[PDB]
Design a protein around this ligand. Sequence first.
Ligand code: ADP
Ligand code: ADP
Ligand code: ADP
Ligand code: MG
Ligand code: MG
Ligand code: MG
Lengths: 370, 190, 166, 370, 164
Amino acid sequence: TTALVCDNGSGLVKAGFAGDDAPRAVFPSIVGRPRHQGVMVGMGQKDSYVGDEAQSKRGILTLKYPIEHGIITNWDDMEKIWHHTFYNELRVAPEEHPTLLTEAPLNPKANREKMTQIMFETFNVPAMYVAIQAVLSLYASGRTTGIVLDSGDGVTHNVPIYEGYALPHAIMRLDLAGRDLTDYLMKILTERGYSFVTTAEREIVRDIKEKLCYVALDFENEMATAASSSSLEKSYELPDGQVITIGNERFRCPETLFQPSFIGMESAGIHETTYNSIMKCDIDIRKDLYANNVMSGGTTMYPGIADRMQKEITALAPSTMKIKIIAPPERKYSVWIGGSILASLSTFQQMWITKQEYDEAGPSIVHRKC
Amino acid sequence: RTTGIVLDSGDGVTHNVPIYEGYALPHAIMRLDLAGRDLTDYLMKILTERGYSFVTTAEREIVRDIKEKLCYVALDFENEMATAASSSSLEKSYELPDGQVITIGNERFRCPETLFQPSFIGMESAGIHETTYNSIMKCDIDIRKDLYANNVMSGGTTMYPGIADRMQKEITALAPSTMKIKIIAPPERK
Amino acid sequence: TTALVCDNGSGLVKAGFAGDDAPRAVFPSIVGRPRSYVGDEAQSKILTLKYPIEHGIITNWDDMEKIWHHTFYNELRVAPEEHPTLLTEAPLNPKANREKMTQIMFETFNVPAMYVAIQAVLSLYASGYSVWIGGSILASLSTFQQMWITKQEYDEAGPSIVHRKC
Amino acid sequence: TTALVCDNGSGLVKAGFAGDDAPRAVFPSIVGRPRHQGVMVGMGQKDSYVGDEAQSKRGILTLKYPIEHGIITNWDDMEKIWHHTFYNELRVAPEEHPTLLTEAPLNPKANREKMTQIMFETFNVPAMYVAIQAVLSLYASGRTTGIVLDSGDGVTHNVPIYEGYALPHAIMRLDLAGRDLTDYLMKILTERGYSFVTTAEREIVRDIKEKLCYVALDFENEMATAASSSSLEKSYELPDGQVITIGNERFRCPETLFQPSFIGMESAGIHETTYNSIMKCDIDIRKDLYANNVMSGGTTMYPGIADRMQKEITALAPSTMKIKIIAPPERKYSVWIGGSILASLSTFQQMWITKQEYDEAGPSIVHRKC
Amino acid sequence: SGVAVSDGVIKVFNDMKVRKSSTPEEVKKRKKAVLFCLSEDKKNIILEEGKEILVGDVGQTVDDPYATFVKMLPDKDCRYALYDATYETKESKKEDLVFIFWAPESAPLKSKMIYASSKDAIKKKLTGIKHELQANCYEEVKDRCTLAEKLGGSAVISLEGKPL
Ligand SMILES: Nc1ncnc2c1ncn2[C@@H]1O[C@H](COP(=O)(O)OP(=O)(O)O)[C@@H](O)[C@H]1O
Ligand SMILES: Nc1ncnc2c1ncn2[C@@H]1O[C@H](COP(=O)(O)OP(=O)(O)O)[C@@H](O)[C@H]1O
Ligand SMILES: Nc1ncnc2c1ncn2[C@@H]1O[C@H](COP(=O)(O)OP(=O)(O)O)[C@@H](O)[C@H]1O
Ligand SMILES: [Mg+2]
Ligand SMILES: [Mg+2]
Ligand SMILES: [Mg+2]
């Protein structure tokens, strides 16, 4: 009866039933093969470790993400993570409840085809559907009008949606996301005397960026304050026991979202892609899209990103237009919230692709249906 | 258990290898040529200052038993020397097989100090309290929390009274304060 | 039926059967030529003592196999052809030492099966002479009885089975 | 008039004037305190020994390197080595000729700040400059296009440089260098019966690696030849009189440059970091960077390292692209050659940071200038 | 190594790790925390039916699932454990299982070596488990903070329905 919604993101896998507020299953999407020979005999040494067991034993593992910027690079570990979150995390079978998968727009069709094939052949689900992460994150907002700024761990994409009709010709996609920010933070933290080279360590930098990084109102004056005094510096407690003192890196690595020239990308920052997509949209819907900029994803959780997004957009947009940046306090899981509120809808229950519909169509039904 | 660095020090070699939850780290395997035989040689060299010459191999076994049943490791070197310097409260006699008796003083804790200060027998290697810390610092940064609280000791050289307390104190002196140090000292570690 | 555990250490050779608490055979591992004598007879007696094992590696092989034959025949009064033997070694050990160990155990004594464990891992087993305690508590385990390298397994593999197995 | 160029490397200090081909001053960068009490009275016993006098009296000293992987660990001995190479080796004063210092990229700013402070306060130079070792090693090549594989004694770093504009976002840094190779050789030589524990001895292993080690075309077949016969073994004359017989260690310890899993590092070998940095570069400059892989440093002096680098890169790069590995016969001092050819340039003579420019700026002028 | 696992322990682990849609009357007899032991011959890993904890009773007869679990471990012998934790993080609310390796120093060496060398024989068969907790002293396992330190470190604000 109930439906499963599985937000297979690049950094986290939010999986839970339909009709509830919060996702019950949340864990990093990495698999870890044992790095060392393992002299001790017995104790249940396994070939792989998924999620929290990998996070706890990350010292002796070699963590890696199966999903790049949205595309699934490796498939065996992806279906392994799916089997894990289905059996060892939710303790349910896929043959009973329909599953709901999410993806980013401007996605290779091979990824969706392999998703459908894996879901229908290995697990044999009665029905499923492949929605868009940004559209669901807009559902969670309760409204139907406004452009969505969805930026997760691997991809940042924006799609403007009017009063039910979205604009596919203005869908912008930026490969700059949280993983790139973590890489830039690792690259700029070596200038302080802290080398993070290995994948296992990189997670420490990820947590440091999650709980110590913020976006400045403006770059110049915050640098001037960084240059003068240590009033800005703050210390962190490392798992090994040492302490580090980061200064301008607290707001320099989040600035890459607005100035991609730091990691080398030529793409316009997240504050300019939205304005360019709205300027590519229709001239009557711009008044409604300017005052509705729905943000989602874990990357939009920095303290002060909403204020800078606002300021930048009213700097780009005309003065008479008013800019509003909807910053929900549960925007980290807004995609899952939208999927769960979508799965309970009665009108949507008819457009699930079913096995009986899938047999004659093959793995190509997903493009024509979704 | 399966997690923890091992301090194995026998009669000829002292080596340390950190082992995690089944996967050991071969790149952090330290080896120190300082062991019980070197301690016996140092005790023979420093016992001649009291008037007892042990030159031959057969005699050397008597010094070995003397070190086995009369030597201990001090909590700290300086204060124990100060107590050695003042009074004979520390000296103890031994029954030799030939019938004579000897009176050893600071040699009870001076020759076991070579395990922590190799400059006595001339070696340049860091003591057994520093090689473990250097190997753990060469290990991974997530396994250090589990290796600090698990220092498994073995071998007959780790049977001195008070070696566990000094190993502890030295490691929490080297390791950060927030980390807790534990020295597993089993009664059958020989 | 019973298995032999032989901790061929650098200073002492703890040798005994499996399933018992204490090693019955303990003696220094030195040979003495008249200026041979192995163990306690060398300790009692005009000789020039020397250790065949350096820091873990076996320097000289003739005296090492002599000490093995001694602890097998003149100390335990048992034949190696009946009970399987268990040898120990230190990690980060040259492969030549383990290869020569396996070759000597399988060619000179012709043991039915054997195994080369690690001294520290066994000393941890004893925690629940610690190396010998762990070897003896390990040899009685039922799950371990399957991973002994046997002569029939050793024939085609040569002296290189020990690296891939242990 | 003339300018001093001082390549303060991790293992050697190449110091000489500008406008000449070869560096006149070359010596190991170690200081040695007297280990023993010194019963003999008189004869000129000193508190320290720097360079060749330390190499000759290394028996009774305790050698140590002030520079780790590029960062200067201890400062008193570093300025002592600078004073030595200035007065007791070149017999010149720093107050007259400007000095040129080198460093590796992705370097802590504290190191460069302390360098500038020591050069301007203790020696009071009229002007100086802090360049990059790889950029200078590329100057020595006479060309301007191509990625540089600079690997010295403490750090290996790669920076791709196009027709004058380098790419700072693709600068890779690997902490694997000659010192790590020497440590691995010491660790793997104990399996033959030769224990090298002390620092003084370690120099013997360093010379053994310098004049007896080579890189194989491939690891597997060379191991098969090592396994079968002694056709590969070669003897060495030790200073004490003994001889040693090394076998597979001749090509096993140099393999760490391509397989860092031997010393435990998780970093990709020197053959993969270059390819990953070029793949991080722009798509039009890859055709020019593939055919230009400038190598420098003393670690790139193994017989056969150029052929293996080639083979590995054409194994990684596409087939249609042609790979070239520029292996100059003076690549051991290529950084010094580039510094000396750079100091004679007329256009560069204007961008030296001077004392009059340094006064108001403090020790922070170096970051904004260089 | 030696000692292997039986079919009952594997069935119990597959029953606990993967839960399914169940009736409200049957859901109260699920296994919350079960220990593992050795038989008379010390050749198989068997769970003892005597010492155990049900999911139904938690919050009723057992006021504290963890508090009543420390005293359940015998201090004179080595034991395995499998604790299903429900901790609250600042970030979110998680529900994971913990593998506790109980090995006191007062136990004989025959029970310590067997359980330490055969740990890879049991841990490898328990697929998908992440949180590993090795405890030797009794005071370190009796403390409540250590579970939050191993699970999530300083991030875990509440453990088992109550704040730290
Ligand atoms: N509190 C926080 N502050 C800043 N960044 C965060 C925070 N929490 C998570 N992140 C970043 O967000 C990323 C998670 O993205 P997520 O929303 O899970 O993407 P997806 O929905 O595609 O899985 C992480 O990589 C992390 O770097
Ligand atoms: N009670 C004791 N106190 C101090 N030292 C001891 C004691 N018993 C033995 N030793 C030392 O330990 C050494 C024995 O080392 P051992 O553990 O047998 O090494 P291995 O395991 O390599 O044979 C002896 O040389 C002796 O000096
Ligand atoms: N002929 C050689 N063959 C192999 N390695 C060498 C040779 N000569 C020097 N080396 C290695 O190169 C290192 C010197 O590096 P160097 O180029 O001086 O670095 P830097 O330029 O940073 O000072 C030495 O540590 C040595 O191990
Ligand atoms: Mg997302
Ligand atoms: Mg020993
Ligand atoms: Mg250099």
